[PDB]
Amino acid sequence: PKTQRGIYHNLKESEYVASNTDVTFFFSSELYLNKFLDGYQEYRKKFNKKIERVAVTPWNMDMLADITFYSEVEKRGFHAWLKGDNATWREVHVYALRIMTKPNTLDWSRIQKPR
């Protein structure tokens, strides 16, 4: 359960969640949730510059950037859902691969605790 300081050590029970309508990321605190939501757009830009210096490709790396920012922002674990079901780290990466072929990118917003 949520600690006196507002922390969820078990991400599965967290009330702090963000979604892009396909994927849902769970956070251990409101501080981490807001850091992700407030910085992912800028991180996508920084991520692309770094990737492009390594290799030029026709791919949309936005989702991979989002997964990477989540891992960097959330310090108490990784917990995600894909299309409403609990997804493993690898399953989220598979989704990011398939998404690389599509031109448009889905944005993220805070949602209420799911079922």
Q: Which residues bind a second copy (CB under 8 A)?
A: 47, 50-51, 53-59, 64-65, 67-68, 71, 90, 93, 97, 100-101
Nearer to a second copy, 54 or 112 (CB): 54
**Least Å from the CB of residue 58 to a second copy:** 6
**Least Å from the CB of residue 100 to a second copy:** 7
23 — phi, psi (to 5°)? -120, 145
Q: How many CB atoms lie within 10 A of CB 57?
A: 10
Spatial CA neighbour of 16 closest among 107, 114, 84: 114
Spatial CA neighbour of 99 closest among 55, 67, 71, 52: 67
**Least Å from the CB of residue 101 to a second copy:** 7
